[PDB]
Amino acid sequence: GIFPNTLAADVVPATIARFSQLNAEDQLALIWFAYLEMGKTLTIAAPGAASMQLAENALKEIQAMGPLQQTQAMCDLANRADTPLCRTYASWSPNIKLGFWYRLGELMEQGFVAPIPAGYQLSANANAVLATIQGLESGQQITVLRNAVVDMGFTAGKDGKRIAEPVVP
Amino acid sequence: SVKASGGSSLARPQLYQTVPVSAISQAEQQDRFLEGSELNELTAYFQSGALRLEIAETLTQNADLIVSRAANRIFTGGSPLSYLEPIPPGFRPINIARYGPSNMQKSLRDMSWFLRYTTYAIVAGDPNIIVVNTRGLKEVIENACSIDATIVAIQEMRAASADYFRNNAQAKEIVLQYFDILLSEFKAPTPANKVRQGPSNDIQGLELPQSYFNAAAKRQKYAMKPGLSALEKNAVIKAAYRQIFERDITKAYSQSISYLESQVRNGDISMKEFVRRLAKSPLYRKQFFEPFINSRALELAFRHILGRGPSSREEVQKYFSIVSSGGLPALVDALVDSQEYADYFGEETVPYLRGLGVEAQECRNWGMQQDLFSYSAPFRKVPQFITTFAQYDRPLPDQHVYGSGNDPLEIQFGAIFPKETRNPSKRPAPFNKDTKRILIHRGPAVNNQVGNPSAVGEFPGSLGAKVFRLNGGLPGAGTSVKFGESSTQALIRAAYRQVFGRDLYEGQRLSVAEIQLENGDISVREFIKRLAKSELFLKLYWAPHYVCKAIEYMHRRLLGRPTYGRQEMNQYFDIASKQGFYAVVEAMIDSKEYSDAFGEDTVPYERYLTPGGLQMRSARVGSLREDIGQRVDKEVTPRFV
Amino acid sequence: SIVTKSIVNADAEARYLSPGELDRIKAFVTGGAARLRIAETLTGSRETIVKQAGDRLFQKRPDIVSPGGNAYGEEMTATCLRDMDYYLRLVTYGVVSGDVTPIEEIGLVGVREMYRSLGTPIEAVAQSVREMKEVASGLMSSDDAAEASAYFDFVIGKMS
Amino acid sequence: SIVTKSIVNADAEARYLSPGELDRIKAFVTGGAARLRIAETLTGSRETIVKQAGDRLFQKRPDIVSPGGNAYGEEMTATCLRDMDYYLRLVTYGVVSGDVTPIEEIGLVGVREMYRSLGTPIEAVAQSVREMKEVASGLMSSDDAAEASAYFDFVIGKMS
Amino acid sequence: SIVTKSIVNADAEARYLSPGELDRIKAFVTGGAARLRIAETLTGSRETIVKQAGDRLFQKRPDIVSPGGNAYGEEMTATCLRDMDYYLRLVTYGVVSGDVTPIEEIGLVGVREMYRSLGTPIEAVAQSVREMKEVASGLMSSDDAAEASAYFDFVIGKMS
Amino acid sequence: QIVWQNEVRRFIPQEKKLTAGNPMNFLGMARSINPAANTIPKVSAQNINIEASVPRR
Amino acid sequence: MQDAITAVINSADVQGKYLDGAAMDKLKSYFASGELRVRAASVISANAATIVKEAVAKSLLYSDVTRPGGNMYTTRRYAACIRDLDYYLRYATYAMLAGDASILDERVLNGLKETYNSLGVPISSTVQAIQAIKEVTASLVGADAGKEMGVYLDYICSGLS
Amino acid sequence: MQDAITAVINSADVQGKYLDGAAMDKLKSYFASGELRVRAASVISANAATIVKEAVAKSLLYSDVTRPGGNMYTTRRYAACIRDLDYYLRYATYAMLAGDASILDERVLNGLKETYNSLGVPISSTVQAIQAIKEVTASLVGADAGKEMGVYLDYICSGLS
Ligand SMILES: *[C@H](C)[C@H]1/C(=C/c2[nH]c(/C=C3N=C(/C=C4\NC(=O)C(CC)=C4C)C(C)=C\3CCC(=O)O)c(CCC(=O)O)c2C)NC(=O)[C@@H]1C
Ligand SMILES: *[C@H](C)[C@H]1/C(=C/c2[nH]c(/C=C3N=C(/C=C4\NC(=O)C(CC)=C4C)C(C)=C\3CCC(=O)O)c(CCC(=O)O)c2C)NC(=O)[C@@H]1C
Ligand SMILES: *[C@H](C)[C@H]1/C(=C/c2[nH]c(/C=C3N=C(/C=C4\NC(=O)C(CC)=C4C)C(C)=C\3CCC(=O)O)c(CCC(=O)O)c2C)NC(=O)[C@@H]1C
Ligand SMILES: *[C@H](C)[C@H]1/C(=C/c2[nH]c(/C=C3N=C(/C=C4\NC(=O)C(CC)=C4C)C(C)=C\3CCC(=O)O)c(CCC(=O)O)c2C)NC(=O)[C@@H]1C
Ligand SMILES: *[C@H](C)[C@H]1/C(=C/c2[nH]c(/C=C3N=C(/C=C4\NC(=O)C(CC)=C4C)C(C)=C\3CCC(=O)O)c(CCC(=O)O)c2C)NC(=O)[C@@H]1C
Ligand SMILES: *[C@H](C)[C@H]1/C(=C/c2[nH]c(/C=C3N=C(/C=C4\NC(=O)C(CC)=C4C)C(C)=C\3CCC(=O)O)c(CCC(=O)O)c2C)NC(=O)[C@@H]1C
Ligand SMILES: CC1=C(/C=C/C(C)=C/C=C/C(C)=C/C=C/C=C(C)/C=C/C=C(C)/C=C/C2=C(C)C(=O)CCC2(C)C)C(C)(C)CCC1=O
């Protein structure tokens, strides 16, 4: 969608690259904790500025599947895995993807979606990247988050990855 | 009348040769800059120019006296100069009274004309004009003019003209040489005409007067022989490439087939075999076979191998059959092995474009061969010889009176015309002032106004387009939720879609006209007139087009039909000449047919189509009905079931 | 340019150019050094003009650079400045040609369609052009300023 | 590609493809994973190949980048490396296609005329392709290296 | 064969075999074992194939062997089955060569003219070739039968 | 002095170069401006009285 | 002409970029469909005359076009129509093998409509005959390769319209 | 022309006999050597210009033929000579790939001796240049492939003799 800032040797591209260094577990936990940090230290969400109807059906499905299936769907999104929902997610614009993650976090906070494992604590590198992002301005923060979540889901042609985050049984 | 035209482009045969034309054409036919030879000829000619103009000046000043001396030596018994517009044994002076006034006038005119063309030849630096117009004049005038008398007159003129040039052997020698050429050429008998016999029974035989050939630019002829120097062989091979590929692709792109060139320059293969193998090559295949349908490819091949375009319907038929059967190799073999090829080029001569001036030309493929010989021939993809030849044998096509390019696509919006220069596709046809184009009604066929002129305005129902009418009352003719706001606005937007094809962008709508219509102050006709005359319509649909294209598109939008022919087209075009765009719009919307078809409350709509437009719409796979153009078999369950 | 608009008008009525049209073209012609001076001044300081105008705009309209605003984010702000640069270049073309046709045909016809599709508040686009006009006028003399301000005003009106 | 080559050959003879041509297409279609793998290797190491080859070339033929040479200057050297990158891209096209036709049609028809007009020595461009071939072969297995070297040497032979 | 066709194509353009052409040649020549096996199968069992094909043909088109037919009589039948055996030999040649050039230039260029001279129905001869194809396929493995089917189909189509 | 090693090390793919109109060309300018986002505005539609607060001009 | 491989290469070359993941996916798809394309082409070549025969018997025989005054009347015109159908089948097979309709525009459609108009050849009847060819070929070649052949036959039909 | 395979086919078809054990053995022998032939052809194509350059350096330059009065004197004639040499190399590569000398006997050796005699091309020096080409190719491609190429280069030289 909107042009992504990938490699420019500046704080925003640098932080984006760092977020891309993190593992799937680190990245997913980082965005969860960033969501918890939204509104106090990070920028708030403005979902009215995104055509979120495109995600509506997908979100409904996530709110219908069982808690284990919900957690697996989020893990699939973070794992660049090939599933119908991952492809649907990838087809969206950056704003829609980011608002979709926001609604997932809202549902988890409300319980409608499987919450984080109890007593989970962010790792070292992920916490450092999150602190960096907290140190940036609101515009820089929204750019960094947009570029963080834009590459999630499945897109054909590209491939790779070896670590994966299956479940928390 | 004739039913088709091959097109007509300006033809410029050379009337006579001049030194600069000779040199520059010598360089240009070989696709090169002028070299030391031609430049030196130009230098010498320009240096001699001052003297030549001196000769011309002195002869034009004293032309009266020279002609008078001639007329006095030749005629006896009166004064030949009463009206101005070495000795052969048979010479005898001619009597003015006996010989007659008309013939005396022609005698004096001819003497003066000889002197005038002699001065022309002096200035041009070449006697070609004299030779051209004097070889065979004798036989033209033997029976009413004495040849001995003319010879004596020319000798007297030669002597008198040279008498003014005691300067030195520079002016005198030139004058004497040109007059000697004139004398020997007037004494010449008429040479036989050059006959171009028909190669088959479908092509006519022709002949050309030798004077016509002498005037025209001579075609340089390249023949490969074993004894030629290496540079000459190089020139011959370059000529072969220029002929077959239409330009020197070796110079341009280093494209070449080296072994073929070695074989032909060794004499292993003849120039004919070299042409055969080059035209079969993947280079030729990629450049002049792959980009074209077979119908156009064979026309280009005729250009490249025979130096001419197809001559008849039968020929294109035969060779299209040949290429359908055996493809490019069969086509090339048939052309190269034809008796015609060997008759012209034989084994050694590189093929050359024949065309005007080289031999007698046919009328039937005149324009098509003019187009074919242009260097832009590769960019015409539509066949021109099969199309034109077929159209000769058939009535006038479905086509605008001024040509196919004047027919826009019958699409919802946009004025899309074929561009004359882009992928040339022009198909001229002779429509006289009275033809009427057959149009297909969008509706019940029997409502076509040709057969049912009182059907005009009969709405077409389900068989035709939707029709928007201000039938309901207008609002405010206070209270909210007045239902008369949706219909009037739907009609306004329909009128915009009709005049412009599609809705305008925000800020473009003529809001004043819309409120003045919604307030009952004007009629629907007046509003569409305002739309048609709007600067937006001018910029979109009038300004960017040929005048008659603009008029035709206008007519289709406003009257819902193409123009019938030259009567409507001519009246609107004449108004365009005299008054301009607004007056043309006025004429269309104030015409009687507009009133009949559309009142003061009906938005115009598509009422008719050309056959081409209907075929575009209804011949696609998803729209083509099952019963159209094929046998519909009734399916019945087998009797054994 | 002006020549093309006058030609179109004169041809639409199947007439040669009138004395008035001819004198108008002549005035645009001979007094054509000032137009090129104005264009050169606008082209020389495009960086500063667009940067200062964008700063002024974000000060006046921080909402467009706040959550939910079109220009929110580094990339969105960059594209906004790019749009302002487009409009400054078009203004220079209009100044040079003595007509508003090139501006109209490059960046105003259907501009409302484009910005409605993009979600961009068009009135803020007109405001950004206002800031660019103010800065450019500060960067030029009085008569040059008036001449440029006329075309800036044309653009602003077409988005207001 | 063999598909277009055979289709053109058959079309010029107004015939369907022979069974031998169809079997050739079948074999070419089956053996495509290796070609795509060689192409993926080459495109992955693009900038490295270009930079190493350019370094080797300018070391070997300093006159090209010394005073009076065609590649002398910051912009000229950049352009020369740009040409090297062009020809690497074409070599990858040829590898993927399994045929030299894309290379020939994009960057060898009339190449002598172009570089003669520009003043570039063509044999030095051939040397540049040789250096690129060596660098590329260094990063591949022997079979893959030979397969890519086929197209590299096609370019080298046509450019010298 | 495919080798001769590739060499002719390369010579028509005055060049060496391209890398793609060499790869096709290598693939063809590595697969020579399968072609030789298919040819051996056809050769060793020629009599069974011809006999069964002729029997099925005569049963399918008795008019050919009926009185008045071209094949009527003992000697005419012997000649007809000799022709069928000849075409089996051609099919084996084509299978080994990789293309249909030997079949084309031995027994298929001008077949219509010869059989029209002899009065034989070309339809019936093509039907006989079809019967030979069916028997040979049933006598051979699926992949091998499919491989031979291409050449049998070429013979049938150009003989119809 | 001109050193070709510096240019070789500085090679950039041609297709990756920015051309006219690319909004990337205004990335540096956008960073320099650093537009100030508004503070999170605290609004509660529940506590607004529409009838009283709406202007009665 | 362009095939699918050359099509993707040229789409990459006009932008001056190397073949990325999506282009490689397109090439893989074409290499995966090549076996079916070759088999269908062999089948069509084996039965080309039969395909045209049956299509003509299905659409044009015993109708207006073959009777005196119809465009297929006289043996010359009948043969010409037959070999036009032969052209269309051969070029549709070419395009199916290449997975690209470029050859059809280049060596079939460019100027064919104008030629037919000049000759008075009925275009709707030609389209119906080509549709009959599509149906016969599909019944001979299979559903999927039949659909692929139908794509290019319909391309010819649309070009004629 | 004939390659090995078509040569076997012709030899059998002359006698109207199927492919027997001997013909099968010859075909297998050719099929086995195909990989080496193709690799040798690839190498020869890679270094054709270099091979010709080294051959002329060894055999022709600084001789009589290059000086005024020699037949390799002018640039036109030098270019013609280099063209003859690379023609010989390319057609020898063709013959080696086909495993048969027929292609040489027709598309190279057809009046060539008569041509050289008529034009005054010295046959001895041409033979020496071809021998230099043979030596260079053998050193550059290997021993077995070297003698495989040498068979056909000797065929050309004998055709000129
Ligand atoms: C080089 C080792 C020696 C040499 C060569 C030389 N040859 C010619 C001229 C010709 N050579 C050929 C040969 C061929 N042409 C072909 O197409 C092929 C078949 C593939 C072959 C083998 C021919 C036909 C000619 C005559 C036409 C032509 O020039 O192409 C020359 C030029 C002779 C001249 O008098 O101009 C030369 C110099 N000469 C030597 O001295 C070397 C020993
Ligand atoms: C958008 C995805 C792509 C694009 C589009 C584009 N189109 C035009 C201009 C026209 N479009 C049409 C189309 C139609 N007319 C019809 O009747 C129908 C069916 C209802 C269609 C689809 C026409 C006729 C025009 C010309 C007339 C007009 O524009 O009103 C343009 C503008 C071209 C110009 O300058 O004239 C553009 C930009 N361009 C892209 O780059 C996209 C891939
Ligand atoms: C009757 C013997 C055959 C027949 C006729 C048929 N015609 C149409 C439709 C039209 N006919 C015409 C013809 C003309 N219009 C003219 O102005 C002139 C010149 C004087 C002629 C000859 C036109 C133009 C049409 C189109 C509709 C219209 O009238 O505007 C049809 C209807 C076709 C349809 O699909 O609706 C028919 C049936 N059909 C036969 O089968 C007979 C052999
Ligand atoms: C009778 C001696 C033989 C025979 C005849 C037969 N013919 C057909 C079908 C057609 N015949 C023609 C012929 C012509 N059309 C022309 O324009 C000309 C020139 C005036 C000729 C000679 C055509 C076009 C057809 C097609 C049908 C149609 O007219 O629409 C058949 C039918 C075949 C079938 O299967 O439908 C037959 C039986 N058949 C024999 O066996 C005799 C030797
Ligand atoms: C058959 C389904 C329909 C039909 C056909 C028909 N066509 C012709 C004549 C010609 N057709 C062509 C076609 C082409 N030219 C090309 O370059 C290509 C592209 C590969 C094609 C397909 C041409 C050139 C001709 C003219 C040949 C000639 O010069 O005679 C005819 C005969 C027309 C005539 O007057 O002889 C016919 C009958 N007609 C139908 O009714 C069917 C629907
Ligand atoms: C000097 C400015 C450049 C240069 C020259 C150079 N040339 C050679 C070798 C040869 N040069 C020729 C050229 C001709 N011979 C002719 O008869 C004519 C036509 C009038 C010309 C132009 C030839 C044929 C040779 C081959 C040697 C031979 O006589 O047989 C060399 C030697 C190269 C080697 O490595 O052996 C050199 C050095 N070299 C430069 O760098 C200058 C640009
Ligand atoms: C302002 C504005 C907006 C911006 C909106 C913004 C900024 C939106 C940003 C929203 C953010 C930061 C969303 C992040 C959500 C993260 C979730 C749901 C992750 C949960 C993780 C889980 C379940 C992981 C569990 C786990 C599992 C099971 C394991 O395997 C083990 C551990 C682990 C924890 C990894 C819009 C874009 C809307 C519009 C435009 C606009 O201007």
Side-chain angles (χ1 to χ4, degrees), chain A residues 15-103:
Chain A
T15 315
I16 284 159
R18 287 217 287 154
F19 185 97
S20 298
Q21 300 318 119
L22 270 45
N23 296 307
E25 178 196 343
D26 275 5
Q27 290 177 65
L28 190 59
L30 195 157
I31 60 154
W32 164 254
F33 277 109
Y35 162 78
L36 291 170
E37 286 308 335
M38 282 173 58
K40 292 175 270 289
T41 187
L42 299 191
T43 182
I44 54 160
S51 300
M52 285 308 304
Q53 53 261 58
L54 268 67
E56 180 176 358
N57 289 347
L59 280 158
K60 284 178 176 180
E61 191 196 74
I62 294 165
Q63 209 171 335
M65 52 181 79
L68 176 55
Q69 290 188 331
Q70 290 176 332
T71 303
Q72 174 63 349
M74 301 192 255
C75 284
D76 292 317
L77 284 167
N79 289 312
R80 273 61 163 178
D82 176 15
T83 78
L85 192 144
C86 282
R87 302 188 154 169
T88 312
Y89 170 88
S91 81
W92 298 330
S93 72
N95 289 22
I96 294 165
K97 286 177 217 200
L98 183 62
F100 161 86
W101 276 115
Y102 184 66
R103 181 47 161 177

Side-chain angles (χ1 to χ4, degrees), chain B residues 222-467:
Chain B
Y222 309 86
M224 184 59 81
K225 303 173 180 295
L228 298 171
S229 80
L231 195 64
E232 293 307 327
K233 293 209 179 98
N234 293 343
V236 169
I237 283 149
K238 283 191 284 290
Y241 271 94
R242 282 200 306 277
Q243 170 61 29
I244 299 302
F245 288 93
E246 289 186 44
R247 75 282 191 191
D248 194 6
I249 59 171
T250 307
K251 185 178 85 182
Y253 317 106
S254 290
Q255 285 170 319
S256 176
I257 302 160
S258 48
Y259 68 92
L260 282 186
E261 297 173 7
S262 54
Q263 287 181 74
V264 72
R265 67 200 315 145
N266 190 32
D268 296 341
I269 59 174
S270 69
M271 178 50 61
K272 171 170 151 174
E273 296 300 326
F274 179 82
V275 165
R276 188 210 300 287
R277 290 165 84 162
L278 191 70
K280 282 165 175 184
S281 72
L283 271 164
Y284 187 94
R285 190 192 55 210
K286 180 171 172 58
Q287 294 187 9
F288 294 113
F289 192 83
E290 291 175 43
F292 305 92
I293 70 175
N294 272 346
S295 284
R296 185 61 182 158
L298 67 90
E299 306 178 342
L300 291 173
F302 292 176
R303 184 201 151 146
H304 299 150
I305 294 152
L306 293 183
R308 68 157 176 95
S311 281
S312 65
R313 181 77 181 71
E314 284 71 58
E315 184 158 54
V316 292
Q317 188 170 75
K318 170 190 177 177
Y319 280 95
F320 180 71
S321 281
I322 292 164
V323 71
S324 303
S325 292
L328 170 62
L331 170 62
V332 165
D333 282 312
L335 279 172
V336 169
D337 287 316
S338 78
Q339 180 175 0
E340 182 174 344
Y341 184 97
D343 186 46
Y344 277 78
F345 315 127
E347 301 289 338
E348 287 179 11
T349 304
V350 172
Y352 53 88
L353 309 179
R354 291 132 73 175
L356 178 71
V358 181
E359 65 182 358
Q361 296 298 286
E362 304 158 351
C363 292
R364 64 205 304 202
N365 72 347
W366 173 265
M368 294 97 78
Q369 200 171 252
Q370 278 189 319
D371 280 322
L372 184 64
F373 285 9
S374 168
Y375 71 79
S376 54
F379 317 101
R380 165 178 270 277
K381 306 293 192 232
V382 177
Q384 199 177 16
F385 289 81
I386 181 56
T387 45
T388 307
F389 283 144
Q391 186 52 66
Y392 290 164
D393 295 332
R394 293 157 172 70
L396 290 169
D398 173 67
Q399 188 173 285
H400 200 279
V401 286
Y402 304 149
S404 62
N406 201 351
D407 273 328
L409 294 178
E410 289 189 8
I411 52 169
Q412 270 180 52
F413 69 88
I416 303 296
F417 299 85
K419 192 169 152 39
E420 209 164 12
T421 52
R422 194 194 164 171
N423 308 132
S425 179
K426 51 171 83 172
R427 302 191 278 291
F431 293 83
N432 64 38
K433 63 192 177 185
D434 292 328
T435 68
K436 183 171 188 181
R437 199 182 188 161
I438 294 164
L439 307 178
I440 296 157
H441 184 236
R442 276 206 57 193
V446 303
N447 274 13
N448 192 310
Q449 65 191 61
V450 163
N452 193 353
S454 63
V456 67
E458 294 292 328
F459 298 140
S462 161
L463 289 164
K466 173 84 173 64
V467 185

Side-chain angles (χ1 to χ4, degrees), chain B residues 293-295 313 316-317 320 386 394, chain G residues 60 65 71-72 77 80-81 83-85 87-88 91 107-108 112 115-116 119 121-122 125-126 129:
Chain B
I293 70 175
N294 272 346
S295 284
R313 181 77 181 71
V316 292
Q317 188 170 75
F320 180 71
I386 181 56
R394 293 157 172 70
Chain G
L60 305 176
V65 296
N71 198 238
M72 288 183 73
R77 289 220 289 285
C81 177
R83 65 180 177 88
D84 276 17
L85 295 180
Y87 269 121
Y88 302 147
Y91 279 112
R107 283 200 46 76
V108 176
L112 182 56
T115 304
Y116 270 17
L119 292 163
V121 171
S125 299
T126 306

Side-chain angles (χ1 to χ4, degrees), chain A residues 2-3 43 46 138-139 143 146, chain C residues 67-68 72-76 79:
Chain A
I2 302 157
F3 83 87
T43 182
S138 291
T143 297
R146 254 199 290 258
Chain C
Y72 194 45
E74 282 286 356
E75 69 285 37
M76 297 297 211
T79 306

